[PDB]
Amino acid sequence: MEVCLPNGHQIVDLINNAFEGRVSIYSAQEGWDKTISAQPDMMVCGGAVVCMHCLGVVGSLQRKLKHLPHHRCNQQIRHQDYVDVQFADRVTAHWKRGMLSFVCQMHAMMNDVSPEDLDRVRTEGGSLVELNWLQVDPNSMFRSIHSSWTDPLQVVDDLDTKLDQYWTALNLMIDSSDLVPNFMMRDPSHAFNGVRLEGDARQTQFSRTFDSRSSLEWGVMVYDYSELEHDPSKGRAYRKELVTPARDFGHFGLSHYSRATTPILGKMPAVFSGMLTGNCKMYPFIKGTAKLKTVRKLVDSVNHAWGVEKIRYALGPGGMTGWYNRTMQQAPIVLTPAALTMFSDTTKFGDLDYPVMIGDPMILG
């Protein structure tokens, strides 16, 4: 049973999903369920069903197939060529599980304040809720050395739905309480290049990538705004004038601007799209070019393994190598979420006045 190669646009779609950890993969032992790690037999890429052992696409979802059809399999496809892609998708999925548990924890803590105390804090500013960063998803690979990408995925339901509901409630609560978080940053670029790290923050190393070469286990990075509370001139009125996130991010109910926290998990801030735009979407701050560079080894492998005519027809002009170079030139065009530019232009409080340290997330006025 012969198999056919995929198109470069289908490949770009597959890469975006892989960085989103949402790739549809089929294994004979587990079928379409990717909860348990296994060598992929098939993947859904850019609208096509790809064979993971022969790199063949001949199927579509319109007609369902119980199993990969018996096929002529080249078996020249090396897992090491694409294992990194599987690794990235699986790690992103584990990361999403960790982010969700952390959001649930923050939501519960935010819901744990007496209204009289809440009102007194709203009136005078100051700490209202603080989460012990050690308590945040301790068993995860990003917070536990024991967890690995190969480990089975934590069984989760409506992860995206739960995250959205909790984030919305939390944002509305902070907006009502006018709390200022030590766990959010107006600008992501400062996080790897700008904010002054403290202690373990100085030792922090950001891969800025998803590869099995860097420890992903790390402490929750937060601002050392302790000196800010200490500062007398920064009174509750003064903070509301300049420090309040509504001054920098705007009203959650009244703003289209995106919201990004500090690198709580895996040294990665979480950024959610503006509510007024329609929905809040959280994605890690990753450059697209690096993901394409990861695909570079597989591109070389495919160029060596596939026929020139087939490669020209599937990968387009310049073959796969030409497609990759053109794609690298267009990576900003197709690999960049708009929400990154959706943050408020105006920032009064800023991200560079105080240092960043691994600490307890907290919001105060």
């Binding site: 549809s24 089929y26 079928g31 379409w32 369920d33 859904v44 979802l61 319109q62 007609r63 369902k64 197939l65 409506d158 995206d160 739905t161 959205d164 799209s273 503006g274 509510m275 007024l276 735009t277 329609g278 929905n279 809040c280 708009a338």
Partner: protein, 389 residues
Amino acid sequence: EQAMDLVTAAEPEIIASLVPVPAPVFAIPPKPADYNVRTLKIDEATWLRMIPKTMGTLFQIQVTDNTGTNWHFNLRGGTRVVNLDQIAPMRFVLDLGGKSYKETSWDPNGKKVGFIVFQSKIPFELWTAASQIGQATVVNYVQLYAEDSSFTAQSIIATTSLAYNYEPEQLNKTDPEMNYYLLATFIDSAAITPTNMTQPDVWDALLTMSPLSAGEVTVKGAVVSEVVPAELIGSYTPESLNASLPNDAARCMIDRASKIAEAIKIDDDAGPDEYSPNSVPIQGQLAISQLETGYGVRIFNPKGILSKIASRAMQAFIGDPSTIITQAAPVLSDKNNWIALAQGVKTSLRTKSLSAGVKTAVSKLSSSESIQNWTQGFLDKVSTHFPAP
């Protein structure tokens, strides 16, 4: 000989039949056509099906596909869907570019929309609850990005072609109660709040539909399993013809007529309003009609005047053969007359024995002779340049 080949292709007695004809012999391959469901007018067309407005029923539903992806989406009031049941196999391609579709916290650009097919006993119009949709499945979905449009302050969705090919075997319908429907709407795995998005469907989009069956025809205002060409003759108003889909037998009749029209044109080159051998069957048909006792108003018209009217009618046919399908066409009112002429035209082609027109050829020869003279003059100038010794 080319005219005889045209007659052989026409098979006019079959194409002039007023009695039952085998459907396959008349049937010919269907042609894909584009429509916008928002632009679609259900009342004029028997085929069009849409949930009636005022039902106002919005309900969110979630289903997983063969891959197993679960998607949350809500059917809403006034939503129309393709009535898949009874339409046989079809492949559809959708372009939604340029529809603003912007939600307050939801940006349409980068959203994914999908095509959903529901299989259930309850009528989709009769659906009032979530359980009624039955076997509803999103066959295909597209996530796309939009950019500013030509309109000032207006953005345009990029050009898109969401496409799915659907055939009857996949549904394998065994129960008449079971009804199949096709809908275009935004589809996502996550639950989507209905209040933000008020669109009943994304059916308000450019849509391309390719028929995988040509077996469905409607005549006498009624869907017909087999087609009678005489019933097809003069049975569609211009708006009614527009309502008629490409699969309608009228279009096939028109193509057969176009081959017949070509044969008639080869047969007669006479000038407009001039009596000709081609109109002799026509004048005879009108004469029989004149012989016919006139129901209600009865009048007598001169044979020469009859000849003039027949010439005008024939010229009108030469201008537009497809007019024949027009319902109660005053110009094309008699089917039997068309049938009789068709047999007569075939006969004239068969009867034809080397008859041709001298005037056009003589004029062409005269022009050729002047061109020959021009050629001689040019050669003479050349000889002035390169004289014969």
